[model samples]
Target: CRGGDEDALKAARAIKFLYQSNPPPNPEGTRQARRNRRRRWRERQRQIHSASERIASTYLGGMRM
Candidate 1:
């Protein structure tokens, strides 16, 4: 879980940095890069959600009598 959190954080920071620091000259290239970034971000988020759910299920199992 902690690992997943770190990965998510890194991905967020990377995307933020790309948007703020690098302004590409070509519109077509920029659009392609943006789509790729979005796809990666979506996958990372889905993994995070699954990890969180798994942890929650483990906690609940331990708590139940």
Candidate 2:
């Protein structure tokens, strides 16, 4: 904290520091990242949904609409 009295300042800096090193999660990239994260957290970290299917969903899942 910049000052012991500045809880707000501390919070603001903490939020800033978090994004500075970690970066904000990209909502677009986050969808993909979370799926990957879940996979990594599972018993079979290697097991994952099909990339082709995901791609199809993004590019051709419902573009016909």
Candidate 3:
């Protein structure tokens, strides 16, 4: 009976820790969060495009010589 009680206490503590670590997201902020994500994605894509353009230009210049 003592061992069983210890096991139950450990299980309850683990459950409480899990809940505290990952609380649910706010419903109101979800939309703004999505917008922020979209903006970040667009900025990332633009950076990638510029980087590719720079590489392409360097390759073309090297080939021309």
Candidate 4:
């Protein structure tokens, strides 16, 4: 409630009156959104940078591609 808190006003003034909404949205949800964005970016990067290789692997016994 920056709109109601005196100290919040003073702090805002110290920083030249920069302010977010009185009550910020959920902080942790913001972080999760940021991580998801980066994860998708990296997934795309890997796909782009690495060309597919021929299938060469034996899972249990039979070789499968």
Candidate 5:
């Protein structure tokens, strides 16, 4: 982030959109953990998506909260 290039960073936002990581700990078979994580993420997605949908749903929206 030091000596940032606005355009390059802007384009990187696109890359962040294309690929995203799942929640930590995998939440594989633990219902509470999985649901808690997923629910938190779902809320975060709803929050970001509201803007991304307006801004064409960027990769930033997909990456993380």
Candidate 6:
């Protein structure tokens, strides 16, 4: 915090710091980042969805829309 009394100031700076590092869950880039995240999260998204068609539905898994 800029000052012990500035809880609001501290919080705002904290949030600013967060975005400077990575896109938040609500950002437009977050969708693409999430797809990238998912791709990294699992090795076999195909098996997770059971087939090629299903995989398409969750492909990007709904990004920024």
- Residue pairs with backbone atoms closer than 3 Å in model 6 (clashes): none
- Model 1 scores worst on lDDT over the 10 consecutive residues at 39-48
Against the true structure, what is each candidate's TM-score? 0.26, 0.24, 0.26, 0.20, 0.25, 0.24
Model 6: how far is 50 from its true place, Å?
A: 58
Which candidate's lDDT is highest?
1
Deviating ranges (above 4 Å) for candidate 4: 1-3, 17-65
| CA lDDT, candidate 1, residue 58 | 57
lDDT of 3: 0.47
User: Candidate 1 local accuracy as lDDT?
Assistant: 0.53
User: With candidate 2 superimposed using the best TM-score fit, by how many Å does residue 37's alpha carbon deviate from the native?
Assistant: 34
Q: Between 4 and 5, whose lDDT is larger? A: 4
Cand. 6 Cα-lDDT: 0.47
**How many clashes show up per model?**
0, 0, 0, 0, 1, 0
Task: Give the per-residue lDDT digits (tens) of candidate 2, residues 1-65.
Answer: 12233455677687767755867757566653553456433245455433223122245334421
lDDT of 3 by residue, 1-61 (tens): 1123445569777876875587678766575356446643425334232222212224533
lDDT of every model, 2 decimals: 0.53, 0.47, 0.47, 0.47, 0.44, 0.47
Better of 4 and 6 by TM-score: 6
